[PDB]
């Protein structure tokens, strides 16, 4: 099966320099393009560019000449986006996408990097219990005051998936980021199962795991 | 450069109707060599884009039947005819006849249901986090349609105004609801001034406001 990994998510101050990788698995790598679309919160994709892992050449839209390269690690089956003298327009999604150039098109993405370019500081979150109380009970994490965006939250090492709302994070008169996710249950389960969730900020390196009881 | 334009930018549909999406190129998308090469993407929300048809009229593999491509030159249509909860996301098309490929805006397929009544959840704020000094309030709207909803807040029964903040999910891919929390963020000092702690809910479901409560220590 054909995946595209690309790596987590990223802070940097405006002038800086990020290099994301995906790295491609299931085929061989050396035969298809490799292309980087860029997506800003709420737009439409847009094509980069990319590169051909036979010849080693790179193709940019207008847009995209100068302050973008693309790299290649065949041995690795990896390919690299940089972007250097960051700018705020730069912060976005980015997805590698895989070229099928028998009928040109992007048969498979990657998962998409998320890169954050600011003045500030990273701030991890802190995490806090949302208690059930009284057939049917919701209980949840608040994952109050970080920053960047964005937070991977999930239920009991994601073995429980089923009736979760990770909310949108909202921005507070601070500059810092909160979010709720909740899930529903049996009533009757809040006296065996034992519910955690598992907080992850990547570019703080935090990472919670947080009881939730009555 | 090639501008691609989608209509319409939102599509409200009801399940088991047929949906139309057209997209437009400012100029031909058939190539010198026989072939046009207009695409379509499906991205739903937080998720990368998936592959949906190639080449006009060409599903992908796993692609359901009810997925349908059509036109020539410089129109094309996207047809879901019966659509499902699951077909919930923005639809892209995407030339890449000329150099550079281009999308276009994309469309969001929203679904119309029936009217779902929410469930109404109160969350008072932690020992932990009263113990780092600020009170945090969530109120929880869970499955419900359609999405305009208002929580108003009332503290020991005085309305609340601007120290609040509401999140709104996506629709839900498997029963196209929405899900809503009103935060209430007050400092643990204004928070102990008080003891009764209400969000009350009014939506198109509900015949009258329901109201969620608790008393501080409990
Ligand atoms: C005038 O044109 C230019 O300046 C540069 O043109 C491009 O880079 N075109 C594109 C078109 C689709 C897709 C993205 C861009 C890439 C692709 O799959 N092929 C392709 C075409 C033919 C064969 N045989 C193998 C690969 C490409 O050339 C790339």
């Known amino acids: 099966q054909v995946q595209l990994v690309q790596s987590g998510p990223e802070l940097k101050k405006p002038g800086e320099t990020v290099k994301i990788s995906c790295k491609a698995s299931?085929?061989?790598?050396?035969?298809?393009?490799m292309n980087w679309v860029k997506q800003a919160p709420g737009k439409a994709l847009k094509w980069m560019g990319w590169?051909?892992?036979?010849?080693?050449?790179?193709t940019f839209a207008d847009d995209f000449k100068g302050r973008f390269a693309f790299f290649l690690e065949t041995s690795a089956t990896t390919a690299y986006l940089q972007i250097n003298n960051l700018k705020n327009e730069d912060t976005a999604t980015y997805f590698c996408a895989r070229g099928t150039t028998i009928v040109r098109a992007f048969d498979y993405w990657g998962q998409g990097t998320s890169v954050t370019v600011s003045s500030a500081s990273t701030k991890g979150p802190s995490v806090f219990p949302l208690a059930p109380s009284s057939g049917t009970a919701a209980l949840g994490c608040l994952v109050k005051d970080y920053f960047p965006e964005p937070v991977t939250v999930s239920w009991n090492s994601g073995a429980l998936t089923s009736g979760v709302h990770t909310f949108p994070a909202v921005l507070q008169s601070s500059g810092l980021y909160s979010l709720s996710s909740v899930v529903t249950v049996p009533s009757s389960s809040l006296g065996t199962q034992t519910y955690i969730c598992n907080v992850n900020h990547k570019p703080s390196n935090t990472k919670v795991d947080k009881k939730v009881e009555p | 450069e090639l501008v691609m334009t989608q209509t319409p930018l939102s599509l409200p549909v009801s399940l088991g109707d047929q949906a139309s999406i057209s997209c437009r190129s400012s100029?031909?998308?058939?190539?010198?060599?026989?072939?046009?090469?207009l695409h379509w993407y499906l991205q739903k929300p937080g998720q990368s884009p998936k592959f949906l048809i190639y080449?006009?009229?060409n599903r992908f593999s796993g692609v359901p039947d009810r997925f349908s491509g059509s036109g020539s030159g410089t129109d094309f249509i996207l047809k879901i005819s019966r659509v499902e909860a699951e077909d919930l996301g923005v639809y892209f098309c995407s030339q890449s006849t000329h150099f550079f490929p281009t999308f276009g805006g994309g469309t969001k397929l929203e679904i119309k249901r029936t009217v779902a009544a929410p469930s109404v959840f109160i969350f008072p704020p932690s020992d932990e986090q009263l113990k780092s000094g600020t009170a945090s309030v969530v109120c929880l709207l869970n499955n419900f349609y359609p999405r305009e909803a208002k929580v108003q807040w009332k503290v020991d029964n005085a309305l609340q105004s601007g120290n609040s903040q509401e999140s709104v999910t996506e629709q839900d891919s498997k029963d196209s609801t929405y899900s809503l929390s009103s935060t209430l963020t007050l400092s643990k000092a204004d928070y102990e001034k008080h003891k009764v702690y209400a969000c009350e809910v009014t939506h198109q479901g509900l015949s009258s406001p329901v109201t969620k409560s608790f008393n501080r220590g409990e």
């Open positions: 299931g085929y061989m790598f050396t035969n298809y393009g």
């Open positions: 100029q031909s998308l058939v190539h010198s060599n026989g072939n046009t090469y």
């Open positions: 080449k006009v009229s």
């Open positions: 590169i051909n892992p036979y010849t080693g050449e790179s």
